[PDB]
Amino acid sequence: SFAHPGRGRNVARAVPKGRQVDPHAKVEIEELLGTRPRQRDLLIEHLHLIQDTYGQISADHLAALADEMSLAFAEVFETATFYAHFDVVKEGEADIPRLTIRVCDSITCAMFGADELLETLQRELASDAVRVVRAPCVGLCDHAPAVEVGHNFLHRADLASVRAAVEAEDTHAHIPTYVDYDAYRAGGGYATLERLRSGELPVDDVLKVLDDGGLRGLGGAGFPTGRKWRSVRGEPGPRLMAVNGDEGEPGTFKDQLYLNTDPHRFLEGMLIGAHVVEAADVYIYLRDEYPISREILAREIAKLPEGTRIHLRRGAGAYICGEESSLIESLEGKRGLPRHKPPFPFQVGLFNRPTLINNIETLFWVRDLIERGAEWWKSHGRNGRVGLRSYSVSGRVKEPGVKLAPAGLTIQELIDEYCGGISDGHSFAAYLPGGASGGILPASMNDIPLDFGTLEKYGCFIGSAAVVILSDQDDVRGAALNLMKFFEDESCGQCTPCRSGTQKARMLMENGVWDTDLLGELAQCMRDASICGLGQAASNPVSTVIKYFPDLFPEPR
Amino acid sequence: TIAFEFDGQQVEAQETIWAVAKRLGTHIPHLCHKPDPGYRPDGNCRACMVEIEGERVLAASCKRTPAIGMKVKSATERATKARAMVLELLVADQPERATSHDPSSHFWVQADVLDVTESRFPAAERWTSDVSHPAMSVNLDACIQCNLCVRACREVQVNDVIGMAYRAAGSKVVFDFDDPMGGSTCVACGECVQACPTGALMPAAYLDANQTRTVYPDREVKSLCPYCGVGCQVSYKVKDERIVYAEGVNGPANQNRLCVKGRFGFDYVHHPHRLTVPLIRLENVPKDANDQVDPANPWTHFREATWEEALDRAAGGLKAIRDTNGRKALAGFGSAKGSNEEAYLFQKLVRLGFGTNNVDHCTRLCHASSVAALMEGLNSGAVTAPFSAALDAEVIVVIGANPTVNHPVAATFLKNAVKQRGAKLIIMDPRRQTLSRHAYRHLAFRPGSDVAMLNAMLNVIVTEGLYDEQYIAGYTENFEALREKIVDFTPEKMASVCGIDAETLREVARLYARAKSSLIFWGMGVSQHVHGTDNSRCLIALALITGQIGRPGTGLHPLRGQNNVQGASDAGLIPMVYPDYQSVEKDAVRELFEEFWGQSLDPQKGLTVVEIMRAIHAGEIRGMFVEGENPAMSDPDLNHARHALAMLDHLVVQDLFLTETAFHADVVLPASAFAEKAGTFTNTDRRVQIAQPVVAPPGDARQDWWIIQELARRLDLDWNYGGPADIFAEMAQVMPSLNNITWERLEREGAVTYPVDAPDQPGNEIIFYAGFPTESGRAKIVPAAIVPPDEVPDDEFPMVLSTGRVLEHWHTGSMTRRAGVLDALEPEAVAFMAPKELYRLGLRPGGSMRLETRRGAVVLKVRSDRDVPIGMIFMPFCYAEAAANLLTNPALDPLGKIPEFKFCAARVVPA
Ligand SMILES: Nc1nc2c(c(=O)[nH]1)N[C@H]1C(S)=C(S)[C@@H](COP(=O)(O)OP(=O)(O)OC[C@H]3O[C@@H](n4cnc5c(=O)[nH]c(N)nc54)[C@H](O)[C@@H]3O)O[C@H]1N2
Ligand SMILES: Nc1nc2c(c(=O)[nH]1)N[C@H]1C(S)=C(S)[C@@H](COP(=O)(O)OP(=O)(O)OC[C@H]3O[C@@H](n4cnc5c(=O)[nH]c(N)nc54)[C@H](O)[C@@H]3O)O[C@H]1N2
Ligand SMILES: Cc1cc2nc3c(=O)[nH]c(=O)nc-3n(C[C@H](O)[C@H](O)[C@H](O)COP(=O)(O)O)c2cc1C
Ligand code: SF4
Ligand code: SF4
Ligand code: SF4
Ligand code: SF4
Ligand code: FES
Ligand code: FES
Ligand SMILES: [W+6]
């Protein structure tokens, strides 16, 4: 019995510092991973694998997973909590209910009553066995209001059909009928690609057809696809390719359409690009909200002969992962934080290798542009523009949906010639030419050709051509608030003008009166100092609403 | 040089735009950019934007380097509007400056340059306080999400505690799974709070119960760290003559990096138990092995006395034993925590005043077996490369050392090397380490089988023709002895002895030999065995036959543990050599010093630390002088060691507190602490660094050198030094290693690696590039057989007891248990066992248990640690309530004279 110089008024930790790894959760995650690689760039997939198996990511599983992958606790927690679809449950936290119901609250579904539907589905159905939550646009705006029950997306949903899907345990995704490998080959599929590969079709011929056709980035930025392809292949190898299937832009849904109808057309246009730039592996990054598209691509990639390795990856609820550098970061198993330019992805991208990145739709058209030539593509067009373009039209139209139509249509032409005009009892008031990011234009400016370039004069851009039509029954200022709420949630948090700016603007826009001057100074700062295009375009709704709808600000400054 | 235009003027760079502007006198606001080494810019805060003509959008001047023909404008309305707007965005969430967590933060400074005093944006209600950690307060409502702390924790230190979780404005700094900082893996290194520009992270010492800052120190003093051999340079914050906080300074070894003991364990100098007057044991109070004194109440055993009387009885008792029983009945234990000048005086006092070579210090229980083999093969008593050489190493070997616990700042550079350069780290240690997560391989071999494992790797390199014949031809000897004897130690046969499968042994041997540069670290796991000299020989043999030495990123680095163990040995504080390792038994050496000191010296080498303990039991050693050593806790087999101290006719102890050793003392002399002295100190890299006093000693404590001179005068030695400078001047004339190193040079340069060739050039960090200081210039390889431990487990004692260290505590605990933060972090005696073993004994984690060996028994808590192998008990020796050295086996390595602290047999019974 010996004294000691310490204070003697504290007790030592029974265990080492921090939280510990549980032996049962370690055994369970050992069993769950099987022989899958414990490499870092599979972190998001293994988090999908714990969430899909157990319905949640408990901390005891998260800790076993970081230990199995040699990662720090903060690295896995950092990454997991970045993505909206991962439920991390700590000590003292309840478990996630067995069934999850997600109700979209983006602009189009909100126009058809999404907020009230969320409240109604919450009072009537939420319980210990059902969780009811909001979600951003899930690419079903032509079926607004969209609601997800498990992995089953209900179109034009109400309480009756969602109640019927729950009580029927109707929670799996319904796979439609599509053009499969046998049917695709019977229509001459995988012919242009094989001629390109074998040697008869020269690679320089492919690059020439693209430059002549003028195929531009259908993901929204409109960069010339041939110019990009030459740039990637003009870089020292090894090179890689990544397919952007995030389609997270509210109002956009053309990629989901082409995937669920004719997937191998996209797969061949992809494998063509993979051959032009000599990519060892291709990565398809499909957003989590497309489980129908996920099962279709899983089935059809397996039907392909054994060539280029195709890695199908799965998003986890994050609109920022549609930015090329953020998608790359997400593919490497990290938080989706955009990188700083320069360098650009075509030179230092996925795994610091020169990386070719293309949108689902851009690759979809490669096969046809080659077999039919550039002059067939440039034959279509309107008002001085050339080429085809897929417009995702939602809102107050009689016939919403993807409209493959000539580039350069006016919004008046796109609505009367392709969408049956405005809905019954609505008058054309405003439209979003480029989804959330492209700003809000009034109905009186309906004579502006819609294509890359034509809208910048007006502070807008066509972007992904997510066309949303609003009417006099809709609220234009409430439209811009819904878009700011979206960006405030989607902002990856990296930099001040976007992280704080989106939040500050949303807070200001909820006052009865808008302080347009302060929003003006902030908008200027956001597009001038934000790192990436999310913050650079987040204020585009507010700026255009202030400029093009003076009647919506009666009060004096 | 890149010439470009900046704000209308032609300038030249190299360096980013921000850095050019700072150097031209144009300060550009910056928050997430920390212009200090190791903090690579991130460009997230956007406070530093500039206008680059011809570019659509503004650029962050901290991220962008200039280009030829670049027009950069920082004073444009457009650029200054964006910067002030960024600051206005952040000021909206900041707590009111006057009562904030840091009203004079770097953030508010940048706010004041943009004249952003208020924000017209609404505030967001954010996170609440986190004060669970006793050293640091977390108040994230001042956080700007600049991730300086994240880089601090995950790039500079690579402690890997902090993260930036969630998304958008919910992006939050978190510890592990957003756990409380005080219940997380945080090691309290303080890198994050030193980097934080907002006060969101602050030293707890600075804030009141409302998390408002209250402590603004009067002054700061640059000095060193009193603890370990990394030699970190430190800035000490003094408020009203009290050290209140400490920061990292850009010293050669540490680059502003610290660990918890350097940043927070400074307050032992202010502890109420600090000795302030001399003590003389009461004339009627006898000595006993198990007798305890109360450090707060020594009047039960001691009387207070003047310096004149305490020194008279201190020297008088030693002088009576010398003059009656002879010089042979005295011995001295020096301090490897003191300065080089004090070690030189102490060894001089024992040799000139006691008349013997019975002088030693804690290096006898430390790297004695390592330096024995290094002298035997290289004639060297120091490392061949700095620990910063790990950054140039392709393969890093850490064997028998736990650097993230015991040399943390150095360990941050080995983790940097893995993360930034792709070094392949191989850890060899029975226990798993926190370092193991970054390692390419971790061999968790059986305790006590280094020779078996390392001889397998020499067998792989020698049989597969992986050695460097050019180097073996030019610079080694005795390599043929190794080929003939190494044949029986095959990976297949040695796999069962060390527990490492034979294929991993070959892979490690192939990897080490084929690397372009390989660097070996080792510590007490290698040296503290009855075969520790053999463990070292195998390591040297690995470096000699592969030529992995003498080049950048290569060599042999036995991690020197004490803050001046290397310097105290340089100054001759060991029984067999004068300063600079000159044999006392070489008549030519003895005659040199006899003329330089003016008296005949003993030609026979003295005894070692444990050999003096035994001589005391034989009644041969009767008086001792102990300064800055606590053998009543640090010596093995304490029941016997404390009994030896109880039998001394006369024990003088010079220390800061009434330690377990001073219990048995006849005279206690209150001494100055590190932060109160000036002098030189030699780190593990041979960097000689000068220290200067931060505060004055309390009461009547005196300078160590002064007390040594006062005892020396009373032993007929006419010394009259003025201080450390005058002593350093005398050492330089007998220490060639100090050539071109002068006190003036260290005062202006701070640190100088030795040996130096010129008073202006830097020192030779890497040595042995062109041969060794042996006779032939070559290094002798010395084969090694498998020696068993002195004590091995049987049925009565089925467990292997190993002893060692924890991050927050130092050796015997006499200093760190008196530092408030370190004592709150590790307040109670614990030993570590595997969970499976706790199950078999029916113990729960935190339960009490009895730990017994043939030599002693203790009762303490058990901490459950899966990184501890089955059949092993690991126990720090820092807890007087359950002193590990009551259990340890005092068996000595015959060549090094070091005990086997790392291996004995023990048994556990629940208590
Ligand atoms: N925080 C802190 N740091 C210190 C000190 C302190 O007291 N507290 N002391 C300082 C001192 S003076 C010194 S010399 C250094 C010590 O520095 P270290 O050598 O790192 O100290 P130990 O904890 O004893 O580490 C020895 C390691 O070898 C392992 N080991 C056990 N048995 C064997 C074996 O048989 N073979 C091999 N190869 N390894 C084995 C043990 O697991 C242990 O992790 O630290 C200094 N640094
Ligand atoms: N079981 C086991 N035993 C071990 C070891 C192990 O690993 N396992 N390690 C061994 C090791 S490597 C060694 S180095 C020894 C360490 O053996 P010790 O040196 O005896 O341990 P310390 O606590 O460092 O002793 C330093 C003492 O000097 C006091 N002091 C501090 N600063 C000053 C100063 O500036 N001036 C003066 N006059 N006094 C000061 C301190 O209060 C302290 O009492 O322990 C060894 N013993
Ligand atoms: C915030 C942000 C979100 C984006 N989201 C998407 C998306 O959902 N789908 C997409 O194909 N491109 C998106 N992009 C464009 C991509 O960064 C990139 O240009 C594209 O994936 C490849 O271009 P391509 O159109 O030339 O194929 C986004 C860009 C930023 C501004
Ligand atoms: S803008 Fe800044 S914050 Fe918003 S997403 Fe791009 S990087 Fe992250
Ligand atoms: S804590 Fe200090 S450092 Fe870490 S992010 Fe918040 S502000 Fe930057
Ligand atoms: S203190 Fe050292 S360890 Fe704890 S968080 Fe800050 S940096 Fe990471
Ligand atoms: S590392 Fe060794 S020296 Fe540097 S601070 Fe921590 S203890 Fe002091
Ligand atoms: S799905 Fe609800 S907005 Fe597109
Ligand atoms: S300082 Fe240039 S961006 Fe943070
Ligand atoms: W030591």
Author numbering:
A (entry chain B): 10 to 315, 317 to 567
B (entry chain A): 69 to 82, 85 to 981
From the study:
Formate de­hydrogenases (FDHs) catalyze the two-electron oxidation of formate to carbon dioxide and play an important role in several kingdoms of organisms. The second class of enzymes is metal-dependent (Mo- or W-containing) FDHs from prokaryotic organisms, which belong to the superfamily of molybdenum enzymes and are members of the di­methyl­sulfoxide (DMSO) reductase family. The metal-containing formate de­hydrogenase 1 from M. extorquens AM1 (MeFDH1) comprises two subunits and is located in the cytoplasmic fraction.
The α subunit contains the W–Cys active site with the proximal [4Fe–4S] cluster, along with an additional two [4Fe–4S] clusters and one [2Fe–2S] cluster. The [4Fe–4S] cluster in the β subunit is connected to the [4Fe–4S] and [2Fe–2S] clusters in the α subunit with distances of 14.9 and 10.9 Å, respectively. The β subunit is responsible for catalyzing the NAD+/NADH redox couple in MeFDH1 and is therefore called the diaphorase unit. The structure of W–Cys-type MeFDH1 is also very similar to that of Mo–Cys-type RcFdsGBACD [RcFDH homologously expressed in R. capsulatus with operon fdsGBACD], although the orientation of the β subunit with respect to the α subunit is slightly different. The cryo-EM structure of Mo–Cys-type RcFdsGBACD revealed that the Mo ion was coordinated by six ligands of the bis-MGD cofactor, the cysteine sulfur and a sulfido ligand with similar geometry to the other FDHs. A highly conserved lysine residue (K44 in EcFDH-F and K331 in MeFDH1) is located between the pterin cofactor and the proximal [4Fe–4S] cluster.
